[PDB]
Amino acid sequence: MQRASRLKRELHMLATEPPPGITCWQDKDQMDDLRAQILGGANTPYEKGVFKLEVIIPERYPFEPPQIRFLTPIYHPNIDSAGRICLDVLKLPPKGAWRPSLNIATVLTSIQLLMSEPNPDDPLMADISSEFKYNKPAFLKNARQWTEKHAR
Ligand SMILES: Cc1cc(=O)n2[nH]c(C(F)(F)F)nc2c1
């Protein structure tokens, strides 16, 4: 009942005040099986791609974070080839940053920010991370080509 009331409010806010570039909605009729979309940001290599994500709300929400993975392939130091995301707010403390005062909208915004600003210090993709650090022009070209191939 606690989780239910919280999800109703989140779905209302996602429907009426979505963050710029972000959409999140119910796949069907269950408030804990959600989908989202993040628009590729301008001045990023993902520009003019559209990235779909799966947003699964666990039983203990809001005390456990949403489980979010990219469905659209993306070329990024912190996102693996299955769409898993390495991001602090998707993880529980002490290492992670999730807390019940965050919500689906804030963490989708954090993923959007991660797309703009990767964290080569916490890589999931070692070869992409090294390319991002030491050969940024190649990283940007590869990230654009992957966006053309899979997100457009
Ligand atoms: C988009 C959005 C804006 C906003 O202010 N909130 N607040 C909550 C909360 F508190 F219900 F979890 N969800 C949201 C979502």
Side-chain angles (χ1 to χ4, degrees), residues 1-27 29-47 49-51 53-94 96-120 123-152:
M1 172 70 202
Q2 201 174 186
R3 182 174 169 271
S5 300
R6 163 78 172 249
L7 284 176
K8 288 182 208 173
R9 186 193 335 120
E10 294 212 32
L11 283 171
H12 172 82
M13 299 294 308
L14 292 155
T16 68
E17 286 179 20
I22 296 166
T23 306
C24 183
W25 66 90
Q26 271 173 263
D27 186 58
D29 61 345
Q30 300 306 327
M31 290 191 303
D32 53 359
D33 185 17
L34 310 178
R35 300 290 182 284
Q37 152 185 306
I38 299 170
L39 302 180
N43 310 317
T44 79
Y46 314 107
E47 199 194 283
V50 174
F51 297 85
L53 302 96
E54 180 192 65
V55 175
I56 305 305
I57 306 296
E59 286 305 321
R60 289 185 58 82
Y61 192 81
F63 308 105
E64 287 185 356
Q67 303 161 351
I68 302 178
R69 57 170 177 136
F70 282 79
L71 300 171
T72 306
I74 184 173
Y75 184 91
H76 192 281
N78 306 108
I79 305 165
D80 79 9
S81 76
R84 286 203 304 146
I85 307 170
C86 186
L87 178 63
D88 52 6
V89 294
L90 293 175
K91 295 175 212 181
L92 286 150
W98 172 258
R99 73 202 79 127
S101 35
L102 300 182
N103 50 61
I104 295 160
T106 68
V107 301
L108 288 168
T109 301
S110 299
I111 296 168
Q112 179 187 55
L113 181 55
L114 181 66
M115 292 167 62
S116 288
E117 302 181 13
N119 290 318
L124 226 38
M125 296 300 273
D127 289 355
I128 303 184
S129 195
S130 291
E131 187 184 78
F132 176 91
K133 295 190 46 173
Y134 298 120
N135 193 359
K136 183 86 163 273
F139 168 78
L140 294 168
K141 165 185 261 210
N142 280 137
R144 288 187 302 255
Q145 288 175 347
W146 209 245
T147 298
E148 193 82 4
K149 183 150 82 163
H150 295 278
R152 277 181 89 131

